[PDB]
Amino acid sequence: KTVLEKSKAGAQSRFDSYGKLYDENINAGENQAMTLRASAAGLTTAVQ
Amino acid sequence: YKSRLYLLWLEQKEITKQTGYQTETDYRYELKLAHIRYDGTWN
């Protein structure tokens, strides 16, 4: 029973870890990176 | 003008009149007019 409870706690750790990554999918940093790419491609009418 | 922001400025260029023997510095003027677009850029 102790063997399976360590297996239970190991699977529970992965389920919490990937569930946390899934729910918070895009960071504040990863959101800022897309915003910069979008701003760099919005200059084409002002350059013209 | 028609609910759009316009800038209007006078701009000067110096030209060179000839007076022959010599020549002479002279100025000419032009009016520039620009407006803002929908995305915040200027025409």
Side-chain angles (χ1 to χ4, degrees), chain B residues 5-20:
Chain B
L5 181 61
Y6 278 75
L7 276 175
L8 187 138
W9 67 96
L10 185 70
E11 186 163 354
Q12 199 192 27
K13 291 183 178 181
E14 54 183 352
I15 61 174
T16 309
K17 291 190 292 187
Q18 61 184 359
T19 52

Side-chain angles (χ1 to χ4, degrees), chain B residues 7-40:
Chain B
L7 276 175
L8 187 138
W9 67 96
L10 185 70
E11 186 163 354
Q12 199 192 27
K13 291 183 178 181
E14 54 183 352
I15 61 174
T16 309
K17 291 190 292 187
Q18 61 184 359
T19 52
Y21 176 78
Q22 59 187 357
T23 192
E24 185 178 359
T25 305
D26 188 73
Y27 299 99
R28 64 178 294 272
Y29 293 93
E30 61 189 1
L31 187 65
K32 302 292 187 71
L33 178 63
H35 63 87
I36 196 168
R37 294 171 179 172
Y38 291 113
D39 57 356

Side-chain angles (χ1 to χ4, degrees), chain A residues 42 45-46 48, chain B residues 37 39 41-42:
Chain A
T45 183
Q48 181 176 1
Chain B
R37 294 171 179 172
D39 57 356
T41 58
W42 284 78

Side-chain angles (χ1 to χ4, degrees), chain A residues 34-48, chain B residues 37 39-41:
Chain A
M34 294 180 189
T35 305
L36 286 164
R37 296 274 168 80
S39 296
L43 290 170
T44 178
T45 183
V47 171
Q48 181 176 1
Chain B
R37 294 171 179 172
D39 57 356
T41 58

Side-chain angles (χ1 to χ4, degrees), chain A residues 19-48:
Chain A
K20 184 177 185 291
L21 292 175
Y22 180 81
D23 290 331
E24 190 265 330
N25 58 355
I26 290 171
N27 285 320
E30 293 168 350
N31 197 4
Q32 286 293 319
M34 294 180 189
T35 305
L36 286 164
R37 296 274 168 80
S39 296
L43 290 170
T44 178
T45 183
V47 171
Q48 181 176 1

